[PDB]
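Exercise 7. Given the components listed, write out the predicted structure of the assembled complex. Treat all entries as one system.
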Amino acid sequence: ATRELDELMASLS
Amino acid sequence: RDAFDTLFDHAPDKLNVVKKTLITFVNKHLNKLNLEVTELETQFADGVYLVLLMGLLEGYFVPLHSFFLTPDSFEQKVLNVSFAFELMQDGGLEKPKPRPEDIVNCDLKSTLRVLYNLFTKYRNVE
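Answer.
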């Protein structure tokens, strides 16, 4: 849940 | 063009991950006031939950005379959103990217940006 959002946002940046 | 533009243009099948995670987050706090969000697309547009959430995250009671608990016009909803944005900046956040009107207009990217920046800032609030 939480980590997955952080990972996604980082990979899109 | 931030990561939210990249998300909608290039990875829109990952939106559900973002939605769910931000819903859990807002509800963790809003549930303390007996409030609930099932839908980020519509339920932040009137500015009420966004104002109350700031009280919840910074840890103060927001006086009701300072905003519109039952907004009856577009302008009253704008004023709520502007007031939540003001409280965000009072907490050390930089000026939100969207206009208050974008939130009232149910722009999802704008709603996601505001909520994500609260998520990142207030990740540790119990």
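Discussion: Residues 74-90 of chain B form the longest helix (17 residues). Chain B has one domain: 1-126.
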